[PDB]
Every structure is written in structure tokens, then in C-alpha cells.
């Protein structure tokens, strides 16, 4: 058991030594490799259970028992006096530089998950390379270095959400006292844009520093996996060649999808062309009903605009139903427009956008209702957001042996390896895990830990906290009431709620019996808090701590007994007395 | 031990009925009782761990075993058929009404703790009077129903606050593309407090109204109690009569010191009537640094005053030190000045208040800083928040026996009983206990919960949870960092910190490396988080939902498995990595 995760260890990392605390040699050689700029892991022999069991095994690796030892790529270097040799004879550069591969790893993408594998990485002495390249629009439209929650998902969402927030802040500064004149307000779409880009472009900067400071190589490249150590890239210049590496990390994300109508690639647009859209998109019809969608929407609107949202079936399909259903009342109650039960069947184009005075173009939307009836509606911009998905073939010769899943995921094991045993995928592509942000990054660092550094704490998905940041915000984290029901029998179940106001509300005039929160319970289980849900404003503050309680194993009473802080949303979760079962009333 | 309980329970219940589940001739007593409008508690006998025990107990005090079994202050009044009796000879309202005391429970005080512990004594038949009075301020101000926070503390409090919060988001708008022309912005004070009082209007007619639907006799009356179960109650009419009570209880709260200096009760206000101010207080200072004093400067301050804080040794005392340093900094860096190590000698009058035409009247203040030079500036007005004080010579007559302590505190047991056994002290009369409105509610409910309904559950007063809603809000639980080292030693506390910027501020324009969180953990007790503390928007928002994590001994691994939410403030607690032993710097 310990041979097996001493023999993993010493085969992966680029550079660790073996150590104690209590070991001036050691210190000796953290010293001459502090001072020759040489990273590396450690592990402290003195702070693990068993590190003495560990230091005999190393015997089978270097053929001693003593600290320190310091490894590269596979291969025992020496005890202190053969490092000292090595410097003393400026041998240690081309030693610990000494690779069958260009790099010990290459990550394939430079989003949330690739590039803090890559940082991590680094740290420990592991050489590395980060490719990204961000495939145009079918409009042209491209952006830097990121991902797609920094360039075209979470960051730029959120900060046109707080734009749309400051929409009702300017409604409730009035009732607080400050006078405005509400109707010479009005807002402008291209000085948000501009401001968002700008931050975004701070991003992209803030990255490539970041790499170059933790002596990580940027290639602006597409790569495409050729073999298990194999990547070729090409670069701006269409010029190709071939960079090999130890361990490969797929990093690549997902794309928009795009239905298979007439006009929709044509004169539609997704996501990764709305957060640097160099127009206002007017009267808009977001065609979908995902979160992009409705956060879409509804941001939209709040910055004043006519907006229909085009649902097939149902809101939020994989949520909590009666919140999806609470999350869309509120939105059709503050300017949303929905079109249910309809999908689209063509768009054509009326007006071409007006490339140099930034105002949209002009769509008709045709489609048609469950009913039977048709829909036929102007638009000036049409929005898709009817799901993404990974574009591997793009990435991986399929002779490499990679398995993918039906929808082209990257099949894992729980430590992100796929088939090919030095390969390991993160974040988006890798089939079945929550698709966010804060995973990839904790996939991508826990990984370049168990390879470099000889971690072994796995990621841990389950009961990961999401919020959906539609204008009335919706965090939870945990089962939806249904799957718990499903999961254990309706008769297992307590489901605890109630409505709330807040404070905010009041002298603002907004509504009672809105906001809402729920607890779902298993009896059997000493009423253990199997999903939160709340709907109401700062819902992503309110829910992340929570999550913490429900990884411990939260119980109803573990929320009773805590006391509440006062006046906030959150402190209702720890009053909470209404069982849906006794039929009483939420609504407070 | 299981007859301490019961004996306990039977003494001390209004209206108690034993109970199982699975009993037909249960369901008949509970049906008749409802028919009836009698409320009760009841004890389902099937559903404890020794309800069986417990059945056998009981027939010490019926002479028999079976269920059910109904009491009536202290007494066994029948098995079902003795009850149905009753009933059809409609003798069940005169023998659940013997008692030899007006009520069952009288609480003297319609604050916070008193209103919440009446209603739910009410709840398991308790007749319950709740008495309230506001002695009026020295200017003659006075308020309705429920208490210091709902009229003159939290609910007011954090209304302006939010007025002051939207001070920035009109800053913000424009950087988010709302055109408002802010040069002919200004603010009214006289609109804030008349949709602040409304509100509060509104909460003191929702508690009339609730008390009423409890059956609760409310009396806004002055009481004072004179032996153990007698109360003497003083109308507006000054007519003095006298009620009894079983059990009482104590929620009468404290009210504004003020300094003992020439002019400060003439010329000076507290925050009892800073809420209700029929003028704008104009150029204003603030004598004091606790958590009331530092959030009326600031939100003074963000709706455009002239606002001045005098401060005789350091902010926040009581506090994390390190913590209050950084809210005292963004309040200086936002407007608010300080006058440092400085104290008030003398309040003189320049000009009276001008009671019709709602402006302030102007004073000269007089003092000395430390340093020895003088303090005197004119100010139009002058708020002492310089703590708080219990009235109890105005409740209790020293002949009854219930001890307080050196300020005047009522000191109790972990069950909230004074020295007279059948009296009982919540919310900040209680000594020891923190002063928050949510601790005095579940204080108040639980004891009731354990007067009639047989509970045993105790209140838990550690890692109570706070907010500081200055400008910059302060969320904390647990212990501050010094009080962790005093404790535990130096080498047993490792900190994690961070600062963090909140995406919002990004294109606002705010700062970067003002925000900051910290965790406080004990290296010998597996990292153990024994304090957590944040600066930043939303506080207690982020903070509530880590109590309930930090009530169940979560330790840094806890936050660490835990994934965050993207984009949050509260995200950063799940991702600290830089210790302060480290030397590293905590910016980002
Ligand atoms: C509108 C929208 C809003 C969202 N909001 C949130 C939110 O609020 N909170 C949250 O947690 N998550 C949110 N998400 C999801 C989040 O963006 C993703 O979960 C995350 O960005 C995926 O990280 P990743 O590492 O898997 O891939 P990505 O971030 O997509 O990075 C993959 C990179 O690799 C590039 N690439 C692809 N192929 C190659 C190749 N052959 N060679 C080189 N480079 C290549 C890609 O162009 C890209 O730059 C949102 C997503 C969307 C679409
Ligand atoms: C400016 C300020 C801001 C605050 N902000 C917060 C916050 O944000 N969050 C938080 O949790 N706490 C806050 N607090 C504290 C909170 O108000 C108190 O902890 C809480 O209100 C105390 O509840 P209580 O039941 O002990 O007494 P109280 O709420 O003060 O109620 C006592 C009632 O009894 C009346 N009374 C007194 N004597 C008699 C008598 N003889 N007969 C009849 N009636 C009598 C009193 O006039 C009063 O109505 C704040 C306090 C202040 C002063
Ligand atoms: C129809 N059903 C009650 C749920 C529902 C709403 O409550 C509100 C908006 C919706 C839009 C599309 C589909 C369903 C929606
Ligand atoms: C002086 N010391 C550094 C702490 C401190 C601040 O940082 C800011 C404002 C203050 C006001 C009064 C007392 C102390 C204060
Ligand atoms: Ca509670
Ligand atoms: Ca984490």
C-alpha cells in the first residue's frame, strides 16, 4: 500500500526530495537549490503517519534509508554530499534539466482547469507548457488567454448581472431618499462593454504574467494530441511541429451548440459573441432555457431591454423544479417575455448589422407552439443557448486510445486519468463531473499535486454549491427535492421551507412571499441535510458556507442550534420550522 | 434522572398532554381539545429513546400507566374518558383556566426576547401578558411595540446603512453605463426616516396583531416586580394595580448611556433618537467607537455628512484588533474623520433645534486629546454611543431576591433561571451573554419550550455569530486572533488570510487588497477553526452559513474539500493557502 504510492511518486515527479524537519542537510539542500533557482517538492518524512515506513522503502529506489534524497524524473541523485558534488561541478543544471521529453507537462487549454494545473505544476520543478487557442466565432469573434469563464462565461455574466442589479438599486435609491430624476436615465450598452473588455483584458494580462513568473511556457497554439507524449501544434503562421511531454493535461472546455435550422449560424449569436458584442442587441430572443439563458435574459432586461425568452419544454432542466418554477415567475413579473412549449424552425435576415454605427440588425424568428400554433416575431438579435459541447477530435487523434463517452466527454477515473495513463482530463471534458469553474481549478491543483508533489487527496464532487445568477438569484447545493424523493422514498423525506423578505425589500416596496428557502431532510437519517435552496438576492454569499456544513454531514438540528445574524437572508436558515407535509403555509 | 425531568415538566407545564403516536384514544383528547380552542403541548411518549421509562414514572403522579394522560398546572386531570367527561358537561374551560395566578407567565418587556418567548408559551397554552414601556428619551422620544432593534437598533440601523449602500451604487452605475447626471444628486434625510418609520410602524402593528392572535394579553405598561409571582403595572393613566404569575420572565433590555459632562443630556442625542430625527442631523459628531458608533458614522457619512468620530482609545474593543484597524481605515479613506485618543469635556448650545422648519440646532464641543492640546469644533449635532446599561432598579424591587451583578446584570444559570427560581432573564439583561437580538429570540423560545412543553434543550452562546455593518462590512464568528493565542499559546496558532476584491468593485473602479478574510485555527487540534473573520460587501451573508460549519468543529480541511461558488466573495474561505507565520503577503 505505501510501495505503491512510493513507486507512483518517485516515478512522476520532476524534482522532489525527501526530507525531515529535524535535518540541517536537508536544509543544506533546500538551501543550494533555493539558491540555484531550482524548484522542487518536498515531503517532510517527520509529519506523516507513517514516514518512517516510508523512509525504509526508499531503500528499493536508492539503496539507503537515510534524509535526504532527492529524486528527478524516476532517478535517486544523491544524498547531500552527491547534490553538493553536482553544484560545486555546475552539474545540477543539466541534471535536473534532463528529460527523454521537452516537458513534464503540457496542458492542452488555457482556461479555469489548464491553467492552475500548469501554476501548480511549476511550482514543484515540473517543466511546463500551456497551449491555448480560441477557435473564431463563426461571426469572427475571438478573445485571450482565460477560458470561457474569464473571456465569455462567469466573470463577464457577472458583471453585466451587477449592471442590471444597479437597474433596481436606481429604482430603490428613490424610496431611501436620494433624489433622481428616474426618467433622463438611461443606460449604455457599449460604455458597460467597454468596461467589461477592459477587466477581462487585465485578465488575460494577469495570466500571461502569472505563466511567465512560475517560468511556465505560453504557446498560443491549437494542439492536437498524436500519441501519449506527442502534442503538435500549430501557430498564428499556420506553422506546424511537435512538443513532447511526460504527463498531458486536457484542458479544453466546450463551444457553444447551435440548432440545425436555417439561419442560425448565419445571423444568430451564442454566449462567446454577447459579452463583447460591439452593438446593443435590442429587442432580443434568447432561444433556450438553460442558466445561460435565463441569466442572459434577465440581465438584458434589466438594462431596459425587450427580451423573450423561447423555452421547448421546461426551465433549468437537472434543478429543483418548484425553484426553476419560482425563478421564472419572478422573471416574467420584471419584463421577461416567454414563449412556452415553442421551439424555432428558421431565421431570416431583414437588416445586416450596421458594422460602423454599432446598432444590431433585424431578424424574423418563425417557429411554432405545442398548440399547433405558429410563432413569427421580430427580433434585432437572436441568442442561442441550447447547450455546449467539447470539440475533441479537434484535440485527439483518435489512435491514441482516449475513450470518450456518447456526448464526447473524456471518460475518467476519480483521479481525472483517462486510457491512456499519462494523460489525465479536467474541468468540462471530463464526462459526468459538474461542469464549474471552482472544480476545474480544484481538479486541475489537486492533480498537479498527486503528480509532482506525491499528494493523494482526490477532488471531491459531490454536493459541489451552484448559483444560477438570474436577477432574482438562486443558490443551492445538494439534491433537488425530487432526487432525494426518488433516491429514498417520498416517505423518508422532511422538507422544511419558508418564504422571507429582505430587509432591502422594505422601504423599497418590492414583494413579500418571493424569496424562498428550503431544507431537504432524510428522517432516517437523523433529519440530515441532504440539498439547501434559496432564492433571493446575495444567494451565492448565502449558500457557500452552508456547503462547507453539508460536506460535514449537516443535520436539521446542526441549522437549529446555530444562532442567526441579524438582519440578514441567511439567518432564516436557522429557523426554519415549516414542514411541507403539514400542509402550513411558507408564506410569513 | 428521568424523573428530575418529569417532575420538572408536570410542576411547571400549563396544559400538557402525554401521548403516542399510534393511540386512538389520543387522537379523541387532541380532537376534543381542538374542538375546544384548548392549547396544549404533548409528549409523544413513542418517540424518545426512554419514553417507556417515562411511562412508568408518570403513574408517580397519576396512578397510572397507560396514554393518554393530561395535566393542568401540576396536577393530573384525567385519562381520556375523564376528559370526555369534562367536555360534554362543559367543565373542561373552568378546569383548564384554575389556576392560582392570573397567568401563567408574565414577561416584563416587548422587546426582541420577551415578544418571542410570550408567542411561543402561548403556543402549549400558556397564559401569557406581555408587558412593554418605553421610557422616553430626555427629548421625549418614544416608540411603539417590539423592542431596541425593531424601533431604535437593528431594523433602523441597517435601513440607513442600505441608503448609505446605495450612495455607492449610484457611484457604480455610471462606471456600468447608467448615464445620471450625480452633480445634481443629493439626498433627503427627512424622506429616509419617514419609509424607515413606516416600516417600523408596520412591525410594531404586526406584533400587536400577533400577540392578539396568540391570545397573548399585551399591556403597555410600566411593570416592576414586587415579590416573586406579583408584578405591579403602572398605565398611561398612572392607575397602579397588581397581576400574578406563575413563571416570569425578565426581557427589559438597557438603553443609551450618556457621558457625565455639562450639556451632553441637553444638547446631545443617542441612537434612540438618531432613527426618529425629525431634521437632518447636518454636520455631525459621534462620541464613541463601538459597533453602533462606527455604523452611524458611516452610513452618516455615505449619504453625503459631515461626520466626525471621537475616539478615546481604540475602535471596536472586544473585537479583533486587526479587524477593527481595517474597518476604521476604509472609514477614514471614505470620508468619515477621526479624532483620535481624544475625550469630550463639555457640550455647549449655539442654537436651539428649530422644531418647524426640521433643521438642527449647532453646538460647540469641548474636549482634550491625549497629546494635550484642546478639541473644540462646532457641530449641528452630537451623537454618545458610549455604551449601553440595564434599568433594573426600575423592575426589580431589591427585596425579591434576584441577584445581579456589578453593572447591574441579572445573573443566571445556563438555563436563563435567576435567583428566584420561578423568574427567568433573556436577551441583554442576562449577564455574560452575547447582546444580539437572535440569541435573545432563541433564548426566549427555547426557555419557553422548557417552561410548558417539557424540552430540555439549552441555548448555545458559543461562536455566536456577528456582523458590523459599517461601510465596509465586518461578519465574524468565533474568536478574534488574539484571544486565540492568549488562549492556546503562539505555536499552537496557525492563520490563514487573504485579501480579495469583489468582481463588482472591478469595474467600479474600488480597491484591490481592502477586502480581507482570515482563519483562525489550532495546530494541535487537527487545524481546528477557532475564529473566521471578513471585511467585505454582504458580510453577514457570507459569515452565517460558516457558523453553522463552525458549531460542528469544522477544521481547515472542512473549507479546503469544500468547493467554492464562482463568482463570490465568500469562495476565497475555500481556497486560503498563505499563513501569516509565512511572512508572505496576504495581497492577491
Ligand atoms: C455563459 C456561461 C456562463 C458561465 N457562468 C459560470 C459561473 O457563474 N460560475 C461557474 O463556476 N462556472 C460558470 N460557467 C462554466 C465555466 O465557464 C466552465 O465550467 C469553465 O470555464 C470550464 O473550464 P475548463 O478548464 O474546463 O475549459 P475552458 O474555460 O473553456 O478553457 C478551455 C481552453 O482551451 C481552448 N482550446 C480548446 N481546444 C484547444 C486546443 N486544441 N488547443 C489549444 N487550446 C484549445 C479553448 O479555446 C479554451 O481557451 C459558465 C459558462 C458559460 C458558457
Ligand atoms: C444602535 C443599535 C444597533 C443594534 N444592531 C443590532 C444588529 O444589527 N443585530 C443584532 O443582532 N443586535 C443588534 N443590536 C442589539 C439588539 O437590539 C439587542 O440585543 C436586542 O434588541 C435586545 O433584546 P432584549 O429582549 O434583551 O431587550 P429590548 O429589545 O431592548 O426590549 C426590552 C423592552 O422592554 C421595555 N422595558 C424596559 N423596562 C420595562 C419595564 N419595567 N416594564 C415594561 N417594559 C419595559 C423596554 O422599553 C423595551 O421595549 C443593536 C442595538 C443598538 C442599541
Ligand atoms: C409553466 N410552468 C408553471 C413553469 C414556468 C413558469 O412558472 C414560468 C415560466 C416558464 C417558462 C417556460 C416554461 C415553464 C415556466
Ligand atoms: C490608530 N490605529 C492604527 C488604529 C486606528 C485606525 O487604523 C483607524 C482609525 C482609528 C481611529 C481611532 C483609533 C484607532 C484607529
Ligand atoms: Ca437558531
Ligand atoms: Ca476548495
Known sequence: ???????????????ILFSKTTCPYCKKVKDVLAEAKIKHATIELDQLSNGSAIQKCLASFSKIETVPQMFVRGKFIGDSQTVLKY????????????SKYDYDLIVIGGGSGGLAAGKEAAKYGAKTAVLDYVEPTPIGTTWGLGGT????????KKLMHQAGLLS??????????????????????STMVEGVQSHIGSL????????????????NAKGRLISPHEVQITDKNQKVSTITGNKIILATGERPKYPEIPGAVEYGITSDDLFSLPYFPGKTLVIGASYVALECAGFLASLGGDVTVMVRSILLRGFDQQMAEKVGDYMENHGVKFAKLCVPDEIKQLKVVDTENNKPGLLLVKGHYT???????????????????????????????????????????????????????????????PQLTPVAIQAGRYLARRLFAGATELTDYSNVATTVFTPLEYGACGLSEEDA???????????????????????????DNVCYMKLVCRKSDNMRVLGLHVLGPNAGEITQGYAVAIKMGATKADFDRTIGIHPTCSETFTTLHVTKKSGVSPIV
Not at 433596481?168 to 450598452?189: V, Y
Open 371 to 433: 398548440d399547433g400554433k405558429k410563432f413569427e416575431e421580430e427580433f434585432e438579435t437572436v441568442i442561442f443557448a441550447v447547450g455546449r459541447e467539447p470539440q475533441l477530435s479537434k484535440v485527439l487523434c483518435e489512435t491514441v486510445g482516449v475513450k470518450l463517452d456518447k456526448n464526447g466527454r473524456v471518460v475518467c477515473t476519480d483521479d481525472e486519468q483517462t486510457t491512456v495513463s499519462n494523460v489525465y482530463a479536467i474541468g468540462d471534458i471530463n464526462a459526468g463531473k
Open 149 to 156: 469563464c474569464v473571456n465569455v462565461g462567469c466573470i463577464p
Open 1 to 15: 500500500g505505501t510501495s505503491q504510492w512510493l513507486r507512483k511518486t518517485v516515478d512522476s515527479a520532476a524534482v
Open 485 to 511: 424523493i426518488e433516491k429514498y422514498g417520498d416517505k423518508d423525506i422532511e422538507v422544511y421551507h419558508s418564504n422571507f423578505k429582505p430587509l432591502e425589500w422594505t422601504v423599497a416596496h418590492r414583494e
Open 204 to 219: 488575460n494580462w494577469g495570466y500571461k504574467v502569472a505563466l511567465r513568473d512560475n517560468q511556465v511556457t505560453y504557446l
Open 168 to 189: 433596481h438599486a436606481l429604482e430603490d435609491a428613490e424610496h431611501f431618499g436620494w433624489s433622481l430624476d428616474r426618467s433622463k436615465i438611461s443606460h449604455n450598452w
Open 87 to 98: 553544484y560545486s561541478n555546475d552539474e545540477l543544471a543539466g541534471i535536473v534539466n534532463e
